[PDB]
Design a protein around this nucleic acid. Structure first.
Ligand SMILES: [Cl-]
Ligand SMILES: [Mg+2]
Ligand SMILES: [Mg+2]
Ligand code: NA
Length: 328
DNA sequence: CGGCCTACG
DNA sequence: CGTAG
DNA sequence: GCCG
């Protein structure tokens, strides 16, 4: 009834089990903060199963046979159905460890390992970190200075204005190059944490060397508040206009050759869980190795040419899912 | 039990 | 180590 | 934590 991998079923952005999925995702996040990637995956997969259901779970019976629901995830759901809250989830939510790890890992330039080290050192607040800038990389300093703006969501209206400025710089860098909106906005989100763009050119090879030329032009326009600088991915903080002022926004820029564009579009459109599940499916069920550059057959030692995302789904034996149904 | 996505900066 | 989805 |  429900297939085991998230890439085998449609997952819409909005659904019928929001509260249940959110609670399981708290436990997934907390498992990640402890370095338990396997538990994180299970709770994420269980949450995503609920997103894919056609109606609300109202009774524990309805979990029977669903993939990724065993004793622990079922107990979480049971407690939410019976009491409206799950004690384990609420204990996580209130915990100093969870709240601090969440706050620190939200900083651009800080991952779980850094956050955990700071936690063990006794640090708890952003102002704790600011008082010890000797412990911070340039990237982390930028992430801390811009943290407040970066915590506020970007609107789709903002996205279109940003895309036109990126297109202007891209067109000067390489006439004929194109800019495609990817990430969560391509999946239909009305808001987001950042904006992701994929850049290519219809003539194979012309995109070589492009990203430095684009970044130099955006920096000369005064739009770049932070970037790391041959390269093909740039993780930036941009200046976005606002009434009478502006705000900082995270923008990711990625270049791919047109031969790789379908794979890069698929990868950068996400969701994160969808892509991990798709790569897992490819390797474990089909014996093929997937990344954002291509799809490799390791027995014939050949790469699959794709001209579209549709081609990639076909080559994996999966029903096509439009981006709006990849919200695993 | 092993496995859990797979890259680039 | 960070980043990405 | 769950699947195979
Ligand atoms: Cl684990
Ligand atoms: Mg994004
Ligand atoms: Mg991004
Ligand atoms: Na971070």
């Amino acid at each position: 009834w429900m297939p085991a991998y998230a890439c085998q079923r449609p997952t819409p952005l909005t659904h019928h089990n929001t509260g249940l999925s959110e609670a399981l995702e708290i436990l997934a996040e907390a498992a990640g903060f402890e370095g338990s990637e396997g538990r994180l995956l299970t709770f994420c997969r269980a949450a995503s199963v609920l997103k894919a259901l056609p109606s609300p779970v109202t009774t524990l019976s309805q979990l029977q046979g669903l993939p990724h629901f065993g004793e622990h995830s079922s107990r979480v759901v049971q407690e939410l159905l019976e009491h409206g809250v799950c004690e384990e989830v609420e204990r996580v939510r209130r915990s100093e460890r969870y709240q601090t790890m969440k706050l620190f890992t939200q900083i651009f330039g800080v991952g779980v390992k850094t956050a955990d080290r700071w936690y063990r050192e006794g640090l708890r607040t952003l102002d704790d970190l600011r008082e010890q800038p000797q412990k911070l990389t340039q990237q982390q300093k930028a992430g801390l200075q811009h943290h407040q703006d970066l915590s506020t969501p970007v609107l789709r209206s903002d996205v279109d204005a940003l895309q036109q400025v990126v297109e202007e710089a891209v067109g000067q860098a390489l006439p004929g190059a194109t800019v495609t909106l990817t990430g969560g906005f391509r999946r239909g989100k009305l808001q987001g944490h950042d904006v992701d763009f994929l850049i290519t050119h219809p003539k194979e090879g012309q995109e070589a060397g492009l990203l430095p030329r684009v970044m130099c032009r955006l920096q000369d326009q005064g739009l770049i508040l932070y970037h790391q600088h041959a390269f093909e991915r740039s993780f930036c903080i941009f200046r976005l206009p606002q009434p009478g002022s502006w705000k900082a926004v995270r923008v990711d820029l990625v270049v791919a050759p047109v031969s790789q564009f379908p794979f890069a579009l698929l990868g950068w459109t996400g969701s994160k869980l969808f892509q991990r599940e798709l790569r897992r499916f490819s390797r474990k069920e089909k014996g093929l190795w997937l990344n954002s550059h291509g799809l490799f057959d390791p027995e014939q030692k050949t790469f699959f040419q794709a001209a579209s995302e549709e081609d990639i789904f076909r080559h994996l034996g999966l029903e096509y899912l439009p981006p709006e149904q990849r919200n695993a």
